[PDB]
Every structure is written in C-alpha cells, then in structure tokens.
Curated annotation (Swiss-Prot):
<keyword id="KW-0792">Thrombophilia</keyword>
<dbReference type="GO" id="GO:0062023">
    <property type="term" value="C:collagen-containing extracellular matrix"/>
</dbReference>
<feature type="binding site">
    <location>
        <position position="108"/>
    </location>
    <ligand>
        <name>heparin</name>
    </ligand>
</feature>
<feature type="glycosylation site" description="N-linked (GlcNAc...) (complex) asparagine">
    <location>
        <position position="134"/>
    </location>
</feature>
<dbReference type="InterPro" id="IPR023795">
    <property type="entry name" value="Serpin_CS"/>
</dbReference>
<keyword id="KW-0356">Hemostasis</keyword>
<dbReference type="GO" id="GO:0004867">
    <property type="term" value="F:serine-type endopeptidase inhibitor activity"/>
</dbReference>
<comment type="subunit">
    <text>Forms protease inhibiting heterodimer with TMPRSS7.</text>
</comment>
<feature type="disulfide bond">
    <location>
        <begin position="4"/>
        <end position="107"/>
    </location>
</feature>
<keyword id="KW-0732">Signal</keyword>
<feature type="glycosylation site" description="N-linked (GlcNAc...) asparagine">
    <location>
        <position position="171"/>
    </location>
</feature>
<dbReference type="GO" id="GO:0007596">
    <property type="term" value="P:blood coagulation"/>
</dbReference>
<keyword id="KW-0225">Disease variant</keyword>
<dbReference type="GO" id="GO:0070062">
    <property type="term" value="C:extracellular exosome"/>
</dbReference>
<keyword id="KW-1015">Disulfide bond</keyword>
<dbReference type="GO" id="GO:0005576">
    <property type="term" value="C:extracellular region"/>
</dbReference>
<feature type="disulfide bond">
    <location>
        <begin position="230"/>
        <end position="409"/>
    </location>
</feature>
Length: 411
C-alpha cells in the first residue's frame, strides 16, 4: 500500500483522540499552515537572539517532528499542537486528516525522485527496549512519516543508548553534506526516565542553476548590525533572476538550484533600514505577497559565500507560542503512544553552507560568457549587510529551511 497513491479511505488512520478545527488542494493548505508556523516561530526565535548572530533552522523538520508527536496526543495537548503549528487553519478538518495531508506533502517532497538537487528526509523513533508500544502508533508513524521504531536500553544503559542514536544521525546527517537540520524530542515518564526519542533529519544538496565563478569572488567588507564591519568573501555574477523591489527599499531575490523545484530566496533591506524591523514586519501574508510579485529581471548579484550553523532549545519559544501541556509532566496528554508521558527536551541543530557551486562541494570551476551586452542601467543586488534567507520548494510552496546571515565572515 503506497501512501503516495493511497486515498483517504485506503489508509484507515485509527485515531484515539480526534479534534475538529474551527470554521493536492489539501497539501497546498498544509504548506500554508506550515509556513505560518515557520515565520511566527522565526520571529520568536529572533527576538530571543542578538542582531549580529546568525540564525538557521528547518521549520519543516520541526513541524514534522511535532506532527509525529501529535499522533499520540489527546485533550488539550492535542489542541495546543493543532493550534501552535496552525494545523487548525485548515478549516473544518480533523487531527487524523492532517496526517493524511502530511503523507501527501512528504511524497511530493521526498519520494518524487530525479535530482541535480537532492532533498532527503530521515525520521526514526528510539523507544525503551522493555516497553510495549501501541501498534497503531507504530504502523502510522512508519507509513506516514517513514519512521521506524528501534528499541534501546534506556533504563539500564542510557550511555550506550545515546551512542546508538548518534551513530544513526551521523549515517544520515553528515558523499558530502553541506546543509542539514536535526531535530530531537525526548519523551520521558513522570519518573524522569527516557521512554522515546523522536529524531528528524532533513538535508539538502544542490548545485546553483546559475553558478558563480570562483575567479570573480573577492574579499570585501560586510557591515554588521553592530555598526562595525569585517572581511567577507563576495561572490559575483550577472544574469536573469526573479526579483522585486518592495516596500521602502527591500530587495527580494530568488536563486534557483538545478531542477527549478528548489530555490533560495534572499531578503535584503536598504542600508538605512534595520533587518530587525523587516523581521518584525514579516507576516506570512506579506511573505507570500513578495514571492508572487517576483519577476525575471536581468541584474548584477553581489552575495557573500558563507557557512552558518545554529542550535537551540525549542522549549521556551514553543511555550510562549502556546505549547504548554506537552512539556508539563502533570498536564501532558500523550496516551496514544504506549499500550504518563511529557516532553522533557526539544532541541534543534542545523547548518547551511553556500558557495559558487551552490549548496554543494566547492569546485575549481570557471565561466565564459561571450556575446553579452547588458543595459548599463540594470538593477544591482549587493548583500554586504545582514539579509534573510529561505530555501523553499516552489511547486509545493513550502519553506524547507530559513535563517539569517548576520555575519558571513570567517575568522
Ligand atoms: C492503541 O491506540 C489506539 C488508538 O489510536 C487504540 O485503538 C482503538 O482501540 C479501541 C479499543 O481497543 C477500539 O474500540 C477502537 O476502534 C480503536 N481505534 C480507535 C481510533 O479508537 C488501541 O486500543 C490502542 N492499543 C493498545 C494496545 O493500547
Ligand atoms: C479528554 O478527552 C477524552 C475523550 O477524548 C474525555 O473523556 C476527557 O474528558 C478529556 N479530558 C481529560 C482530562 O481526559
Ligand atoms: C550509511 O550506512 C550505510 C550502511 O547501512 C551505508 O551504505 C551508507 O554509505 C552510509 N551513508 C553515509 C552517508 O555515510
């Protein structure tokens, strides 16, 4: 039974606790949901960080992790999830249906093979070796999120347990891997013993559709939010890119990878406007508006060559966002997982490496453009100051990664 084809009827979905939201078409709406959480969570994460600190994460990964957890959710815990991750914005739907749409979203995201640009997703459950897990939870987790259940000796050998998990992450999350994201959820019982660990991996390998030439790269000044500056490696190139100059100076620019399914969007505000303001103003609706107004346009592209990485606890922000019960040893309601449970820890680790090739291994490459004469009055895009970055799947319109480049300088 292939999920990709299977209809809603074919895949039962024996849901323990069902919840009705207030008042491909579905797959498209889930992406909106997923994107609403993304930008929101980013704003929270941003306010908790310093302006000149880089930010990077994969919100798709996060949504997926907590969607998996939602499988056993019940009562308020269930609702809070549906609300915090905006799953309830798919008007008049139900807990279990969200998982059908995710099965579809995943298919068109990962199963659809044919690269030049590679997007792979790996999910695994690591549950206590000596417990009896609910078979519906098992099956559905496997079916929908392709997550298998591996037993570990959490009780008597937590040390070796951690090793087992890491040996697996390494085999998945860093062939070369220049961009990835890892999400870990620790589920514990009232006794402070690890019952289950949810692990989500997503990583991307993509060659620029219009690659820069290393020969044209040169050390130049990047201007930090602290008013100082440092030496960045500026990549350079001229060409046809989807672009748009929106509200008060802000430049939006799309750089697609080979395949055209996956692209990198940059958001670069004028020198006199702070990235902070833009971040605060970045509502899901505005963002969508910007992506639409994008039109091909010959221009020059000055963009630094960088490697950013990030790591943070999901707990605080998620709580402030409404997700309380799930972390509350007393309130946490996840009955559908074992035949109590609460989330003790939820951390996220990610990094993105970009260069003349794209999200790929640096290479000794050159470029020759022969009979070209471009209007001396063309637009220029010089990212020598902090700018946002998304890596979205266009067809499905989902934000795979996102972050901020506040300092690309390597020193
Ligand atoms: C695992 O949880 C599932 C719900 O996700 C339970 O399945 C239900 O079981 C009850 C009684 O056994 C049936 O009346 C329902 O038809 C089943 N489905 C639903 C959606 O409720 C199941 O009981 C649990 N299994 C174990 C071993 O605890
Ligand atoms: C949770 O939902 C169940 C049935 O879905 C219901 O019986 C119960 O009253 C709700 N609240 C609690 C605290 O169990
Ligand atoms: C992961 O391990 C498998 C063996 O199951 C091996 O075939 C594969 O090459 C490894 N992948 C990476 C990225 O190391």
């Amino acid at each position: 039974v292939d999920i990709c084809t299977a209809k809603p009827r074919d895949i039962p979905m024996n849901p323990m606790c069902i919840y009705r939201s207030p008042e491909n078409r579905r797959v498209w709406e889930l992406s909106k949901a997923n994107s609403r959480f993304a930008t929101t969570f980013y704003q929270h994460l941003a306010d908790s960080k310093n302006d000149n600190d880089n930010i990077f994460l994969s919100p798709l990964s996060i949504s997926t992790a907590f969607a998996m957890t939602k499988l056993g959710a019940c009562n308020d815990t269930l609702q809070q999830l549906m609300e915090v991750f905006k799953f309830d914005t798919i008007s008049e739907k139900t807990s279990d249906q969200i998982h059908f749409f995710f099965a579809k979203l995943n298919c068109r995201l990962y199963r659809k093979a044919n690269k030049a640009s590679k997007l792979v997703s790996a999910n695994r459950l690591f549950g206590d070796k000596s417990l009896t897990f609910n078979e519906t939870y098992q099956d559905i987790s496997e079916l929908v999120y392709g997550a298998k259940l591996q037993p570990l000796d959490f009780k008597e050998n937590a040390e070796q347990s951690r090793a087992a998990i890491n040996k697996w992450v390494s085999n998945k999350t860093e062939d070369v891997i220049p961009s990835e994201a890892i999400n870990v959820l620790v589920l514990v019982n009232t006794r402070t013993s690890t019952v289950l660990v949810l692990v989500n991996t997503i990583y991307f390998k993509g060659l620029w559709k219009s690659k820069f030439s290393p020969e044209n790269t040169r050390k130049e000044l990047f201007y930090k939010a602290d008013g100082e500056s440092c030496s960045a490696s500026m990549m350079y190139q001229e060409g046809k890119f989807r672009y748009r100059r929106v509200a008060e100076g802000t430049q939006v620019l799309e750089l697609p990878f080979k395949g055209d399914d996956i692209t990198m969007v940059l958001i670069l505000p004028k020198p006199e406007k702070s990235l902070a303001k833009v971040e605060k103003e970045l509502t899901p609706e505005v963002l969508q508006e910007w992506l639409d107004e994008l039109e091909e346009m010959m221009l020059v592209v000055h963009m630094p060559r960088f490697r950013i990485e990030d790591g943070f606890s999901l707990k605080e922000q998620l709580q402030d966002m409404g997700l309380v019960d799930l972390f509350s040893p007393e309130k946490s309601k996840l009955p559908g997982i074992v035949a109590d449970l609460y989330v003790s820890d939820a951390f996220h680790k990610a990094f993105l490496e970009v260069n003349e090739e794209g999200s790929e291994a640096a290479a000794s490459t050159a470029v020759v453009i022969a009979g070209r004469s471009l209007n001396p009055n063309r637009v220029t895009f010089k990212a020598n100051r902090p700018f946002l970055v998304f890596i979205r799947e266009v067809p499905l319109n989902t934000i795979i990664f996102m972050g901020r480049v506040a300092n690309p300088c390597v020193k």
